[PDB]
Design a binder for this molecule. Structure first.
Ligand SMILES: N=C(N)N1CC=C(CCNC(=O)[C@@H]2C[C@@H]3CC[C@@H](O)C[C@@H]3N2C(=O)[C@@H](Cc2ccccc2)NC(=O)[C@H](O)Cc2ccccc2)C1
Ligand SMILES: *[C@@H]1O[C@H](CO)[C@@H](O)[C@H](O)[C@H]1NC(C)=O
Ligand code: NA
Ligand code: NA
Lengths: 102, 10, 147, 27
């Protein structure tokens, strides 16, 4: 039930129309969803306890890791037809910079 | 089941 | 993480564990973005419907970890929080809109092979990488299964 | 200014076991 060490999983970003149609919760531009669709075969998803963690991507241009999202919510965990929703970090970057600049 | 952490960390 | 795999050592040096003091338990994951700032989800710190309203003194952040439960002596670093900042418009009433929060560490954390900050994207970075089909990576010490 | 570069990987020019999967998706 609980892992002994840090877990990792790579997941594809999903089209907005699909994210929206997978849930009853109102999606906003400050969110994005990721995960494999039922017919893709592969699985994987964040879950309870992962909350707050990072969704990162490695740039093929400068080879640095960037945090694009924060594990936020989801209906169940790794259910077919459902996806993981993440806070859109860039969309909220002005606030981030405002706080740090203090 | 978390191992105790040093007392210095409150 | 469900249907994932064991992370490699030093694979995610920006991964942070939000640790609850008492009872000593994992609270949430988080990320290191500088020597004194940690990013996490707002609902990890504040969620009135459940009467959750953590204050700086209720928790600690453990950085440089790999093992979930053990105290990784000579590897992990434990910091105390100076201040918590929750997005003023975080919508806990409805859909967790703007689910984001920052935590300033009391003292800067020393970087190492296991402790290093992640970058935050700029417009062009977000625009070019945040596209359907493109894959990102998620990490954490959460449930391996839904139930 | 060294954000995103892992001491045990990029800094040493070593790749982790699945980062290539991410690169491959960025078509
Ligand atoms: N990436 C994934 N999958 N995840 C999941 C968890 C995370 C990270 C953890 N984050 C969460 O758990 C957040 C916190 C939020 C407030 C406290 C509590 O009410 C649970 C609510 N969450 C959900 O995801 C809701 C959906 C929701 C979204 C927005 C506003 C209100 C509700 N899901 C469920 O309640 C059950 O999963 C439903 C359920 C499913 C199956 C069985 C019983 C009940 C990311
Ligand atoms: C959370 O608790 C703090 C400290 O007691 C208080 O100032 C703040 O108003 C509370 N917020 C909510 C939503 O309860
Ligand atoms: Na819908
Ligand atoms: Na799914």
């Amino acid at each position: 039930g609980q892992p002994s060490v840090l877990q990792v999983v790579n997941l594809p970003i999903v089209e907005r129309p699909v994210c929206k149609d997978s849930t009853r919760i109102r999606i906003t531009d400050n969110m994005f969803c990721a995960g494999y669709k039922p017919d893709e075969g592969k699985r994987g998803d964040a879950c309870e306890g992962d909350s707050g963690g990072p969704f990162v991507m490695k740039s093929p241009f400068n080879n640095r890791w960037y945090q694009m999202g924060i594990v936020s919510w989801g209906e169940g965990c790794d259910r077919d037809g459902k996806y993981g929703f993440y806070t859109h970090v860039f969309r909220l970057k002005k606030w981030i910079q405002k706080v740090i600049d203090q | 089941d978390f191992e105790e952490i040093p007392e210095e960390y409150l | 993480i469900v249907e994932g795999s064991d992370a490699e050592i030093g694979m995610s040096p920006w991964q942070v564990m939000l640790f609850r003091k008492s009872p000593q338990e994992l609270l949430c994951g988080a990320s290191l973005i500088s020597d004194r700032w940690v990013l996490t989800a707002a609902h990890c710190l504040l969620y009135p419907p459940w009467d959750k309203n953590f204050t700086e003194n209720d928790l600690l952040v453990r950085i440089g970890k790999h093992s979930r439960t053990r105290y990784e002596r000579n590897i992990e670093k434990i910091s105390m929080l100076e201040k918590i900042y929750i997005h003023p418009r975080y919508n806990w009433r409805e859909n967790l809109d703007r689910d984001i929060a920052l935590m300033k560490l009391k003292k800067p954390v020393a970087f190492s092979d296991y402790i290093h900050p992640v970058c935050l994207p700029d417009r062009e970075t977000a625009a070019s990488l945040l596209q359907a089909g493109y894959k990102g990576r998620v990490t954490g010490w959460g449930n391996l299964k839904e139930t | 200014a060294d954000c995103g570069l892992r001491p045990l990987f990029e800094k040493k020019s070593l790749e982790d076991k699945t980062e290539r999967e991410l690169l491959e998706s960025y078509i």
